[PDB]
Amino acid sequence: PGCGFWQPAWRVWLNFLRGTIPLLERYIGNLITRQFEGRSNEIVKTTTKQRLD
RNA sequence: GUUCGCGAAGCUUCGUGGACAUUUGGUCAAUUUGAAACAAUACAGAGAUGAUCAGCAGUUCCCCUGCAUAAGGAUGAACCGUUUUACAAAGAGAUUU
Ligand SMILES: [Mg+2]
């Protein structure tokens, strides 16, 4: 042990985070919205295998 | 305070006219009384059907978890009860005018 050179790994993680930014903003943001103002009348979707028949 | 001019005393100091800069912040004010929930105790207690159990939906002025148009919530919640009139036609018997 004692190999430094964290750069490429770091870069990779940064790039991963990029993707998340969006996903988290939809997700976390959505959650917080719900917490403040929690949904009225959701519509289920029969394209699901379950419930189709 | 910066300063660009005027007027008095000794470039230094007072007295003035201007220019520069110009209206912040609050849907809120710090403990009970403007609304959080679980938990706990007590008491019961689990969809059809005889019983045991799966899953899916459905209605709603019920929601929760969930990123969710996934999925999951006691089959997620309440539905299991009440239920007498657009009501006429025919026949028989009885009291009143
Ligand atoms: Mg179940």
UniProtKB/Swiss-Prot annotation:
Source domain of life: Eukaryota
Localisation: Nucleus
Assembly and binders: Component of the U4/U6-U5 tri-snRNP complex composed of the U4, U6 and U5 snRNAs and at least PRP3, PRP4, PRP6, PRP8, PRP18, PRP31, PRP38, SNU13, SNU23, SNU66, SNU114, SPP381, SMB1, SMD1, SMD2, SMD3, SMX2, SMX3, LSM2, LSM3, LSM4, LSM5, LSM6, LSM7, LSM8, BRR2 and DIB1.
Additional facts recorded: Present with 468 molecules/cell in log phase SD medium.
Free-text comment on this protein's domains from its UniProt entry: The MPN (JAB/Mov34) domain has structural similarity with deubiquitinating enzymes, but lacks the residues that would bind the catalytic metal ion. Contains a region with structural similarity to reverse transcriptase, presenting the classical thumb, fingers and palm architecture, but lacks enzyme activity, since the essential metal-binding residues are not conserved.
Function: Functions as a scaffold that mediates the ordered assembly of spliceosomal proteins and snRNAs. Required for association of BRR2 with the spliceosomal U5 snRNP, and the subsequent assembly of the U4/U6-U5 tri-snRNP complex. Functions as a scaffold that positions spliceosomal U2, U5 and U6 snRNAs at splice sites on pre-mRNA substrates, so that splicing can occur. Interacts with both the 5' and the 3' splice site, as well as the branch region. Has a role in branch site-3' splice site selection. Associates with the branch site-3' splice 3'-exon region. Also has a role in cell cycle.
Name of this chain's protein: Pre-mRNA-splicing factor 8
Organism: Saccharomyces cerevisiae (strain ATCC 204508 / S288c) (Baker's yeast)
